[PDB]
Design a protein around this ligand. Structure first.
Ligand code: 11X
Ligand code: 11X
Ligand code: 11X
Ligand code: 11X
Ligand code: 11X
Ligand code: 11X
Ligand code: 11X
Ligand code: 11X
Ligand code: 11X
Lengths: 173, 173, 173, 173, 173, 173
């Protein structure tokens, strides 16, 4: 993982390593860059499943000390541990008991997934799905004692790119 | 459906027709007794899945006008539309925007499922699972506008049997 | 099957009994109304899978002697043998070695599937999917000796409703 | 179930109602002809799965009091509760604690499944699979206390047809 | 694989790399530490599936020349090739045609899987499952000519830890 | 990937790294040898699935600049990213808009998969399957604008081995 480039053309053309496929059984994996393996992190107490694929941009460091994380919408779930070339639609702003958290929302490169080319920004994402994603983050850790998540709202591509820009910078010191 | 007996020996030995398997994709089916078919009722807005199998006791009529409904815990999900001989462990008491709702909690007959014979009452059901079920009912209809569910708590086998007793009585007028 | 109503309000509000779920393994089932069971019709030589759910309107008789058939787009595949309340978006016009064939394109009632409410007519169906459906019909029977299918194009809701109207009429003699 | 014909042309052209798909999770279902539903019979103690589809010929009565049962080899598992038009390859002779048991081995009609047309008799069935089936019957009930199964060997199409012939006769009194 | 630590705190807190998920299709994989890939070892003649997840402790060498192997009980199967932080419940003692074989029985760290925290020792593992595991090992290689497995019985956490202790020692020469 | 040997005994005994399992959802992955990861290449416009497992021989370079690719027939799909020891049955000759393309057809080593040992050459592969594979290649890229594939026919083990021989040579310069 630690040698996969952050992107062909940052911040708009970036790579995402998938950790949790959309609709997978409710087990959270986290990539160990140090090992090149997915690690079983948690069996989700609520047993709720990610509504979209979940992963990270390698060679990034967000303020929380982990890589920039990303939700990638696709017509079929992606393989855990695989890498996909992606583009941003925006971000979901949240705060939990430890501080700010933001998850980017992305889709594959148009050449990879023509099915998603019509999605130009976060607002093109179907209402039911944005609502579903918001609900997921608000509730999935409900049975993890000591934890809480509050969703603040959505932001656009600019904000997503800033997040990418900074994470790439921080990672290099 | 309308000719399947409520039970071999009511209220302790009863039958459950399965409508929604544990962990099935988030689509709610409802049996049409008049037709002998499962009907697509709703695509669940939250996309949350039933943590246990869900069905009903045929030839019962609860106060809400539908048959007595039941959660049936099994080691592998049951086939939608199949029937299972069951025994009660208790009930989950709830109220929603339309009034009282109670869902029985059951397991298969010991001869059918030896794996569940150790469960004698609701208290033997693992904490994580009862918590998971409570959370599911509190949140699954969160994105159905106009709807709400509040979970009151659990009750034992006596209460479950009363519910069966009355539903069987009401159904016969 | 033979007692399930064609629809609550024909031709715009109709019922579809599902025979083949979207993306199911490549085995064609056909409902036997006389028996109330799905019959294994054919293992598809090309092994191609239906890109959308496939079924029929009960109590209809199309000119080809079978019920009016329908493709039903949903976010998760529907259960074979289940029934869904649907509305039409249009039709796919085709001809095969035996004559005209038309398949309606439908989605569930808005109350059943909010995810599809945005689809008002055939033109709202994503390009990639219409193309995918056209390709499927043109090729799926490619390895059935003696058979061929040619796709003529799409038509709108009016045409779909006429097809429903006539099939309902014919079925009653 | 009780109205599905035993066959279009007995004993060589017969119908099989599927109860347990090949490779399904290890739950035994049994069709209730009286109800027209599949009943959960047993969660298999060994958790072993049927290596081929398992069902019965309707309107037959074998000496053991149940319908003639049949293993149906197909390239993809069949839907539980569906019906398939079949032809026999032979039988597996067995005895258990209750007496003789014989399971026919069948494949779909050549027009249904071209993939199986090459199988003319039991000897054309791959060695590994016959061995696998024999092992399954010898071991699957190993953890059902009081039960045992001994496999005697295989027999051909004649024997299979006799079994069909008699079961059809007995069923009619 | 060869750089994943044996454990955070040996022998009680160790790591397991998963090779075969619970209930996966009957194909045996073996991790190639030299390559960092899972290798297709065998299609199991009996077609029996592992009842629990199966893997190994990296950087261990058992007396048989392979790493210490482990069965890891979880509520949903784990991803092949993933790593899980685990704790031992005991061991299953066996002998096959090549000599002693022992498989540890483990569960994830309590923080990873709260669902398993109630299991303190091998005796807390449900009877049906221990029986199922014993049966699996006794029979799964039944159709591998030249091979046999005899199960001797179970042992506790002490024995499991000794096995870990020695394998870690041997691996380092 | 780049360190996995081409084979134990080239050209007849070789290794195949699997990229796309038989019957997987229609997403094309390509191994990045430089990274040791599978990359999402394309969501297949036709949504057609590989009828057999698809992968490549590592440390080979075909004339088209990519490694020698191989279809591997197995009784259950193989894990993406896994490696299997294989033997050739022949090849499928094709041309597309960019030039010659040939895909080898292989099965696992007899010791790995006894189920396939009966297949000695391409002609032993069932007709329906060869036809299915030919159809797949002729049609799967039908909705990739600018692309086309024409299937020329099949060739035997000699031709397959030549392809292996040359790819191994080219890779080493
Ligand atoms: C949540 C996550 C993924 C999907 N996938 C459906 C989809 C995506 C893109 C284009 N066409 C169809 C749906 C909901
Ligand atoms: C929710 C619903 C069903 C299960 N099934 C697991 C189970 C049930 C009974 C006995 N042994 C294992 C688990 C959670
Ligand atoms: C719901 C009901 C019972 C259980 N039983 C716990 C359990 C542990 C290990 C194996 N199998 C089962 C779990 C969920
Ligand atoms: C073909 C058939 C069904 C789908 N389902 C995806 C879908 C449908 C409706 C609304 N949102 C997402 C996609 C392609
Ligand atoms: C068929 C019909 C509608 C769609 N809707 C596109 C879509 C994008 C993202 C999430 N969900 C759905 C896709 C296929
Ligand atoms: C056991 C049961 C079914 C199968 N199906 C594979 C198969 C069957 C017929 C023709 N071609 C391939 C294999 C083993
Ligand atoms: C049961 C019956 C027939 C077969 N047929 C063998 C086979 C080889 C390659 C592809 N498809 C089928 C296998 C199992
Ligand atoms: C065999 C292997 C795993 C399971 N998983 C069920 C389970 C495990 C732990 C806690 N709750 C439920 C069951 C049997
Ligand atoms: C296409 C690809 C794989 C299969 N697998 C079935 C099979 C293979 C070998 C031996 N026995 C049965 C069938 C068609």
């Amino acid at each position: 993982f630690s040698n996969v480039p952050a992107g062909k053309d940052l911040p708009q053309d970036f790579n995402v390593i998938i950790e949790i496929p959309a609709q997978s059984e409710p087990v959270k994996y986290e990539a160990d860059k140090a090992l090149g393996l997915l690690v079983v992190d948690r069996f989700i107490g609520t047993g709720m499943r990610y509504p979209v694929n979940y992963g990270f941009i390698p060679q990034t460091l967000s303020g929380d000390g982990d890589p920039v994380d990303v939700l990638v919408i696709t017509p079929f779930p992606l393989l855990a541990g695989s890498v996909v070339r992606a583009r941003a639609l925006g971000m979901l702003k949240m705060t939990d008991e430890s501080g700010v958290d933001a998850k980017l929302v992305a889709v594959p490169h148009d050449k990879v997934c023509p099915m998603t080319a019509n999605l130009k920004s976060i607002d093109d994402v179907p209402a039911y799905l944005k609502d579903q994603i918001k609900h997921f983050f608000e509730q999935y850790k409900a049975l993890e004692k000591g934890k809480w998540v509050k969703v603040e709202g959505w932001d656009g591509i600019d904000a997503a790119h800033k997040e990418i820009t900074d994470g790439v910078a921080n990672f290099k010191k």
